[PDB]
């Protein structure tokens, strides 16, 4: 199989990229505990700027901003009690210093506030003190998955908690934080996970004069619960085609209001993950997730990271690496100061090809092969490239041994040969690079099940 590298971004090429399309998000009560408790987010972190020349935008969210009040006069960044070190906690309190926590950070920030609890003063004051605390603030949420609200909850006010009742709420605490901050372009609206019952696409209809007031529009995604755990499925270069292809009308929706649509918080399955997210093939899957996401016209994706010590989707904790950080890093990689990306395959396959383009030239080519791999023979496809220039092109290869390699049990990914020390994320071993010849403009190249390539032109 054959792909032609055109001298040009093609027609079907994303838009200009982000400085940084590939972003993390924190689970707002463990927040401080990433920052304080985590020597490896610090250096996690850096690596990606290290590549892309941009800090990883930033968001800190989830199910627990929503248990979460504002206490202006608290000195601690946040406060809560759990009965496990593995539990989230039912409620807490968060101090300024939260917010000038995140304002330590230089990369773009997102914060995620409270609306279930209907409090829109202490939300207000939240949200004022974001915006003196953090100077890279891009973004307040108000309220996180809304679409899991009830009619039990404060913001229902005693009636059934629908789509509309949610769309009316966004707009009426969009301007009431807006207009109290004299602000505009703040909300990272929506937050909805997946379309149904709330969607972008309806959010929008709604918005009106509302939308000077929204930054971006936000979607959530995780693919799989730990019901329907399966890596193959996960990772499979077409299955990921279908399973983003509901979020193409919402990105359509944002677009057409100016606003940017992000995925402001996803990751491989639900509820911290299960058996397959920390493991090598998930991290397959978030690289191919990102290229296909920003194709379709997504400006940021952020990758959650939740309960510390009891989280199968994070790219690190406390004690040892996540396989997953190396998709993030071959992305971040690929990605690094590059305006488009265009897809060369079809979608219909396992296999994949993108040219990256910087200053509307193509400058690499990244290739993966999707196919589940544990046992046996280990199959490969070979992949030609056309259009090349010179007599040689080098690559980097992102591998493992199979698709359920972890690191913990010590089946490390690497990435051109390197990995990550356990404990600190500091880069590890002797990059090796590959060269393959050009002649008549064309270079093959061999990956096995389960591997990607990067190759600079
Ligand atoms: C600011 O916030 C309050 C709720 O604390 C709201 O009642 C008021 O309408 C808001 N003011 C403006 C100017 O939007
Ligand atoms: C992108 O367009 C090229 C032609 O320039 C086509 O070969 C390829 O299949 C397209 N890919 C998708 C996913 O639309």
């Given at each position: 199989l054959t792909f032609n590298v055109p001298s040009s971004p093609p027609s079907n090429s994303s838009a200009q990229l982000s400085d940084a399309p590939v972003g993390v998000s924190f689970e707002f009560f463990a927040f401080p505990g990433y920052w304080?408790?985590?020597?490896?987010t610090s250096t996690c972190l850096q690596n990606l700027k290290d590549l892309s020349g941009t800090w990883p935008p930033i968001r800190i969210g989830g199910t627990t901003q929503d248990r979460a009040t504002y206490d202006a006069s608290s000195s601690q960044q946040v406060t809560y009690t759990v009965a496990n070190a593995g539990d989230a906690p039912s409620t807490l309190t968060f101090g300024p210093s939260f917010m000038s926590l995140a304002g330590t950070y230089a990369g773009q920030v997102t914060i995620g506030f409270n609306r279930r609890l209907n409090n829109l003063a202490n939300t207000v004051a939240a949200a004022s003190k974001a915006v003196n605390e953090?100077?890279?603030?891009?973004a307040i949420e108000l309220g996180n998955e809304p679409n899991f609200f009830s009619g039990s909850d404060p913001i229902a006010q005693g009636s059934s908690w629908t789509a509309s009742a949610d769309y009316a709420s966004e707009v009426t605490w969009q301007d009431a934080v807006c207009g109290n901050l004299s602000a505009s372009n703040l909300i990272s609206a929506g937050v909805f996970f997946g379309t149904s019952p709330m969607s972008i696409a309806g959010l929008t209809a709604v918005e009106g004069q509302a939308?000077?007031?929204?930054?971006q529009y936000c979607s959530h995604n995780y693919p799989q619960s730990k019901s329907t755990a399966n890596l193959a499925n996960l990772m499979s270069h077409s299955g990921i085609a279908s399973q983003i292809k509901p979020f193409a009308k919402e990105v359509a929706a944002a677009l057409a209001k100016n606003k940017p649509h992000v995925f402001g918080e996803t990751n491989s399955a639900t509820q911290g993950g299960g058996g397959i997210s920390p493991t090598y093939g998930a991290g397959l899957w978030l690289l191919d997730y990102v290229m296909q996401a920003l194709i379709m016209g997504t400006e940021t994706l952020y990758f959650h990271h939740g309960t510390i010590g009891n989280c199968?989707?994070?790219?690190?904790?406390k004690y040892s690496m996540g396989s997953p950080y190396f998709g993030a890093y071959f992305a971040t990689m690929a990605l690094a100061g590059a305006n488009k990306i265009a897809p060369l395959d079809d979608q219909t396959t396992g296999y994949a090809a993108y040219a990256i383009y910087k200053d509307d030239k193509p400058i690499r080519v990244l290739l993966y092969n999707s196919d589940y791999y544990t046992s046996g023979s280990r199959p490969s496809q070979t992949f030609t490239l056309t259009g090349l220039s010179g007599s040689t092109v080098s690559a980097k290869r992102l591998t493992a041994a199979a698709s359920t390699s972890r690191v913990d049990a010590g089946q490390s990914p690497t990435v051109a040969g390197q990995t990550f020390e356990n404990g600190s994320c500091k880069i590890q071993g002797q990059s090796t690079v590959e060269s393959a010849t050009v002649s008549g403009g064309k270079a093959t190249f061999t990956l096995q099940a389960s591997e990607a390539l990067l190759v600079t032109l």
């Open positions: 304080n408790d985590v020597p490896s953090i100077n890279s603030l891009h939308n000077s007031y929204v930054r199968q989707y994070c790219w690190w904790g």
